[PDB]
Amino acid sequence: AIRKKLVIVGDVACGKTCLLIVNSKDQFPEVYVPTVFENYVADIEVDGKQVELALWDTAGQEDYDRLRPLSYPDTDVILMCFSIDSPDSLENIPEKWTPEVKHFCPNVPIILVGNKKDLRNDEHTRRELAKMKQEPVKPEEGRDMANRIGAFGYMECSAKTKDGVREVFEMATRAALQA
Numbered sequence: 001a002i003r004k005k006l007v008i009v010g011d012v013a014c015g016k017t018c019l020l021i022v023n024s025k026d027q028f029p030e031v032y033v034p035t036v037f038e039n040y041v042a043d044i045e046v047d048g049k050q051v052e053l054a055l056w057d058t059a060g061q062e063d064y065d066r067l068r069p070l071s072y073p074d075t076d077v078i079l080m081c082f083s084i085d086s087p088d089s090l091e092n093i094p095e096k097w098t099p100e101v102k103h104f105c106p107n108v109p110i111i112l113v114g115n116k117k118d119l120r121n122d123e124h125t126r127r128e129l130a131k132m133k134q135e136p137v138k139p140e141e142g143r144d145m146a147n148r149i150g151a152f153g154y155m156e157c158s159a160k161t162k163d164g165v166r167e168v169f170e171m172a173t174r175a176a177l178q179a
């Protein structure tokens with residue numbers, strides 16, 4: 001079996017841990033975990049190709065800026081996340097996440113992921129953003145950002161509804177295998 005390491009980064013609350021936890025065989029309600037603390041492994045076949053992806057979660061706060069790089073050694077693919085209900089989280093993609101990842105993970109492919117796709121048409125989300133004269137991120141904005149940062153691809157998903165989640169991890173596996 002081919003062994004690859006994946007790291008997920010992005011602002012706190014943008015859905016990183018939930019995205020990884022969709023893959024987990026075992027589930028544990030009413031426990032909030034800042035990061036996946038167990039050795040969670042994704043088993044993905046890509047055209048008769050048994051690949052095991054170790055999934056590494058990260059803490060996005062500024063307080064962890066000096067310890068977060070402990071997660072980066074020997075990474076094979078990055079999931080770089082923002083959330084579609086948070087224009088601020090997209091702004092931090094070029095300003096914080098891209099230079100940090102390119103520095104610690106040189107030449108490692110980046111999948112840019114827009115999380116919480118279910119919230120784009122959600123009435124409450126629309127109202128909360130609208131009161132500050134904001135709106136959910138549009139797909140064209142994610143595509144434009146993937147171009148600016150040189151990402152391998154841009155994909156949208158919802159850990160809540162599960163839409164797009166498979167594609168994220170299958171594309172991350174395809175990315176990890178090119179090197």
Ligand SMILES: Nc1nc2c(ncn2[C@@H]2O[C@H](COP(=O)(O)OP(=O)(O)O)[C@@H](O)[C@H]2O)c(=O)[nH]1
Pocket residue numbers: 010011012013014015016017018019033034115116117118119157158159160161
């Ligand atoms: N509506 C919706 N909420 C989500 C989704 N993913 C995560 N959440 C919620 O967003 C909050 C933060 O998620 P979490 O995975 O802990 O974010 P992290 O800080 O990036 O790890 C939690 O309350 C989740 O229930 C999603 O796809 N859709």
Ligand SMILES: [Mg+2]
Pocket residue numbers: 016017018033034035036057058
């Ligand atoms: Mg988390």
